[PDB]
């Protein structure tokens, strides 16, 4: 109970300093940050896997050239969101209609 | 002398006909644009400049019949295409 | 881009003479080292209008 | 006898002391191409795209 | 296919009527080499068939869009496989089916040894032999669509084609067509796929959605149209 | 000075009946009147005006009457009638200036000393030329040339308070108007909106014909402005800017498709309750 | 060396110093020499805070004037040494200051958010009804032309 509350604090401060870091950088080598940040390369890649798998941070991981890419996702996206569903929606109503077809 | 057909204008432009060396080219779109006369921007790493630059000058009479063609190129451009909409949209606009 | 002696083999074209000259019948030519958008803003303009008429004009 | 009177007239007098008169309007064409400028709204108008973010907005509203 | 091309099916014509014009001409242009249009146009006819009844029509219909689909190279999906009214008189081609996706030689000619009576009951057998010999076409399809570049020996080894030229032959002939978009490069061995560009901003949805505008307010015209209000 | 001038429509309609009261006989073509409204630091609006005897000779054009007096009578009266408005500058038809324009402006000056001229054109109404407001300036004629005086264009609005756009509406309600636009007027505009282009264009490449044969002498700010305006032109190459094809394509989903949908599921509900209903009637023709 | 500091223009530093050690550094006869950047420990300290405010100018004007930069180019342009001159641009960025976002090879000083399409399709709109300039454009060329017009 301070062993485990010890641990959560230090992936904490690892994932404050990973934000507050790198923050500048837009495609940076991992093995500049690890030595930025003090850390091995395959434990910051694995901490920076796990951070975009959570959402955390966004962000993508090119281990192709052992390289960490930084962007954002636009959220013009709500117009479709409601476009889709109200689709899905007039899907029923043309059920229904088909209903009333019976009828004629 | 580019008439925003090409407006990216590479640092190999400058350097000879300005006959400058390429590293002071940054220096003098530096000087021009802070002094007012250009507003465009410089992209080092593929060395060119984006110009868009509100300085005029007098219009050497060919220059302004030129200009007046440019001109003509527009209109007729303006007016061949307000025809097409017109025949169009002849349906709806009674 | 294929290099000329690869399409000598599998064409079939035994005598190198027989291929280039074959590759002179066709417009897929030899090449220098032997290795045989806007926005239209018309057409569609005239769909959006013809979406206008079919909206008025009435049935 | 195309419009009918008011009541508020009629007390007021009407049809017994004084008679309404018809009333008609003369506007000629030059008048009403005149005024029709109050509202005319431009050459440009017709050419000027709608703020692209507030369209948006109001598309998804 | 000479009748067809000089005569403009009704438009106005019954649904019914539809779909077995559309079954016909798509056997056409399926015998007749044209696949891709000829799926396209056996998947409108059984939308456009009756849902309760034509079981048999539906089961030819079915059957010959499993043979469309898998000379193609694409691979029908088993939903089909497993309706009641629809199962045992696919079984055959189901079993037809599952050796294209495995390219099993043998298990083809067993299928055709032991089932031929039933295909040319249907009238099958020609267009089961050309996929007798496109299996490896499909094989090709499914590689391309999974792998994005590739060395050739690796396509002749997967294959089993025994030679990396007849890969590069058969990988060629295939991408002349539409099933694969790629492009071989013969000086080291790539069989590099096409690189997929946003198909937004490309002026594509803009297209599709207009023949959707087209086809909707073409619907709404001809409802507004057929109102016919009564006398009385 | 004044950033821009608010013509009301009653100094329209007053210049109007004006131009036709003098024109019965008054074939001068061009008429003189003042026009008063309140004033302000900021936009300027105009809600009145009369017209004073002028008279106008062809000969030099600088042999002019107008009478000053009756100009300081009438604005006697308005000022009695309604002193809120007091005198802001003068109006005439013809819409050549004539050389006096300066000259009577000096007039003018005296009982107002902003005075604009407003020219208030009468037949010509085709595309965007209710109004003209001019307003003179002390300047030689730039930097480095001679002295002049050089009216100077000041944007103009047709603008009208209550209890006068109901009158102007009361007078329109002709097959007009319909507030609400619907598409076929406002593809309408569009096609006013490029004939009016299209008209500044050819207005613009006629200066240019005159000056480039030495017709006319070439105004140098006049050519700074065309080429400011060539090179504020865009460029729909460049293909950051071919994008726009994403929000154009984002246009279409919202309408077209979605739109279009619902309007075509409605449409064949309507006939769905149609063919029923006369199935109905029908029936009970039993 | 106060209205240098003022307008902007890049500072190159090899001139700045070149140019300025003789009196910042040393004294002059005519002016007393100043105390705060003498050979003291906060005299040094002092001539590195310049050395930094000099490259700080440098790189917002850069970001007020540049779209994108190579770090070795930047570097000699500072005149830092490339991992200093990226460690620099970094703390400037961190601290929510000159907005950057450094590549390997391209350490672009702006580009703002690439322009989305919704903000560069509203700058485009915005430069074509700033063409109705044109309008005034012609009205004015009747008008301040009608006086020659009749004076031909």
């Known amino acids: ?104 | 002398t580019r008439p925003a057909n090409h407006r990216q204008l590479t640092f190999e432009e400058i350097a000879k006909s300005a006959k400058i060396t390429v590293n002071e080219v940054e220096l003098l779109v530096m000087k021009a644009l802070s002094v007012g006369l250009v507003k465009g921007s410089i992209d080092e790493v593929d060395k060119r400049v984006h110009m868009t630059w509100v300085q005029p000058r007098v219009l050497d009479l060919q220059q302004i019949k030129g200009m007046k063609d440019r001109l003509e190129f527009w209109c007729t451009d303006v007016k061949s295409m307000e025809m097409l909409v017109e025949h169009q949209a002849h349906d709806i606009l009674t | 881009k294929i290099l000329f002696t690869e399409a000598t083999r599998i064409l079939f074209f035994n005598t190198p003479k027989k291929m280039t000259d074959y590759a002179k019948k066709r417009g897929w030519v030899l090449g220098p080292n032997n290795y045989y958008t806007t926005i239209p803003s018309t057409e569609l303009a005239k769909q959006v209008i013809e979406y206008a008429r079919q909206l008025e004009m009435i049935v | 006898h195309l419009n009918k009177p008011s009541i508020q007239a009629l007390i007021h007098g009407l049809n017994r002391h004084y008679y309404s008169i018809t009333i008609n309007y003369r506007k000629n064409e030059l008048e009403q191409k005149m005024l029709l400028n109050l509202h005319k709204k431009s050459w440009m108008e017709g050419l000027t795209l709608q703020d692209y973010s507030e369209h948006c907005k109001h598309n998804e509203s | 296919e000479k009748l067809v091309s000089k005569s403009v099916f009704p438009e106005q014509a019954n649904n019914n009527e539809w779909a077995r014009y559309l079954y016909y001409t798509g056997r056409i242009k399926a015998i007749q080499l044209e696949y891709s249009e000829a799926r396209r146009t056996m998947t409108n006819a059984l939308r456009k068939a009756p849902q309760h009844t034509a079981v048999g029509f539906k089961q030819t219909v079915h059957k010959l869009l499993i043979v469309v689909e898998l000379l193609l190279g694409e691979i029908p999906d088993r939903l089909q496989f497993r309706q009641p009214s629809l199962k045992r008189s696919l079984m055959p081609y189901f079993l037809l089916t599952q050796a294209v996706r495995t390219g099993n030689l043998a298990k083809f000619n067993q299928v055709l040894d032991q089932f031929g009576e039933k295909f040319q009951a249907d009238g099958t057998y020609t267009l089961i032999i050309r996929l007798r010999h496109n299996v490896i076409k499909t094989g090709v399809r499914m590689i391309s669509l999974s792998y994005s570049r590739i060395s050739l020996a690796d396509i002749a080894q997967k294959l089993q084609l025994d030679s990396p030229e007849d890969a590069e032959f058969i990988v060629a002939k295939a991408i002349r067509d539409g099933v694969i978009e790629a492009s071989i490069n013969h000086e080291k061995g790539y069989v590099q796929s096409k690189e997929m560009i946003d198909i937004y901003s490309t002026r594509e949805p803009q297209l599709a959605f207009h023949q959707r505008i087209s086809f909707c307010l073409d619907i709404h015209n001809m409802s507004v149209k057929a109102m016919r209000f009564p006398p009385k | 000075a004044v950033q821009k001038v608010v013509v009301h429509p009653l100094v329209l309609l007053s210049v109007v009946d004006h131009f036709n009261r003098i024109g019965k006989v008054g074939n001068q073509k061009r008429v003189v009147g003042v026009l008063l409204g309140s004033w302000q630091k900021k936009v300027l609006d105009v809600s009145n005006s009369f017209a004073v005897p002028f008279d106008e000779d062809d000969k030099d054009d600088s042999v002019w009457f107008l009478d000053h007096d009756y100009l300081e009578n009438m604005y006697g009266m308005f000022k009695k009638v309604n002193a809120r408005e007091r005198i802001v500058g003068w109006y005439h038809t013809g819409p050549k200036l004539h050389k006096n324009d300066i000259a009577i402006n000096e007039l003018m000056k005296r009982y107002c000393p902003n005075s604009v001229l407003v020219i208030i054109d009468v037949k010509p109404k085709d595309l965007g030329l209710p109004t003209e407001a001019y307003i003179s300036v002390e300047e030689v004629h730039d930097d480095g040339t001679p002295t002049s005086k050089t009216f100077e264009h000041v944007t103009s609005e047709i603008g009208a308070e209550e209890a006068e756009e109901v009158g102007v509406e009361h007078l329109l309600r002709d097959i007009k108007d319909t507030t609400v636009g619907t598409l076929s007027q406002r593809i309408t505009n569009q096609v006013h909106g490029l004939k009016g282009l299209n008209s500044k264009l050819l207005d613009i490449r006629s200066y240019l014909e005159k000056v480039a044969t030495g017709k006319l002498p070439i105004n140098h700010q006049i050519i700074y402005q065309l080429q400011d305006v060539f090179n504020l032109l865009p460029d729909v190459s460049l293909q950051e800017f071919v994008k726009a094809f994403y929000l154009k394509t984002n246009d279409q989903m919202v309408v077209v498709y979605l739109a279009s949908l619902i309007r075509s599921v409605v449409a064949l509900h309507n006939l769905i309750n149609n063919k029923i209903a006369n199935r109905d009637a029908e029936k009970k023709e039993g | 060396l106060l209205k240098l500091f003022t307008t902007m223009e890049l500072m190159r530093w090899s001139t700045l110093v070149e140019d300025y050690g003789m009196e910042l550094r040393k004294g002059s006869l005519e002016s007393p020499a100043t105390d705060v950047f003498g050979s003291t420990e906060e005299g040094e300290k002092r001539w590195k805070d310049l050395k930094n405010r000099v490259v700080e100018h440098n790189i917002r004007i850069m970001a007020k004037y540049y779209t994108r930069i190579t770090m070795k180019r930047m570097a000699q342009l500072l005149d830092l040494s490339v991992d200093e001159s990226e460690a620099f641009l970094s703390n400037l960025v961190v601290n929510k200051t000159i907005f950057a976002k450094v590549d390997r090879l391209a350490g672009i000083i702006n580009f703002q958010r690439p322009k989305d399409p919704n903000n560069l399709l509203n700058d485009w709109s915005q430069k074509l009804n700033s063409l109705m300039s044109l309008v005034n454009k012609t009205t004015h060329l009747i008008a301040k032309e009608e006086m020659i017009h009749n004076l031909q």
């Open chain 1, 1 to 104: 109970i301070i062993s485990t509350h010890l641990a959560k604090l230090y992936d904490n401060l690892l994932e404050q300093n990973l934000i507050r870091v790198i923050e500048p950088f837009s495609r940076v080598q991992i093995e500049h940050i690890s030595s930025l940040i003090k850390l091995s390369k395959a434990d910051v890649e694995r901490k920076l896997s796990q951070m975009i798998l959570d959402k955390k941070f966004h962000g993508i991981l090119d281990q192709g050239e052992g390289v960490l890419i930084i962007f954002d996702e636009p959220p013009v996206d709500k117009t479709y969101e409601a476009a889709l569903e109200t689709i899905q929606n007039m899907s029923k109503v043309v059920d229904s209609l088909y209903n009333k077809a019976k009828k004629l």
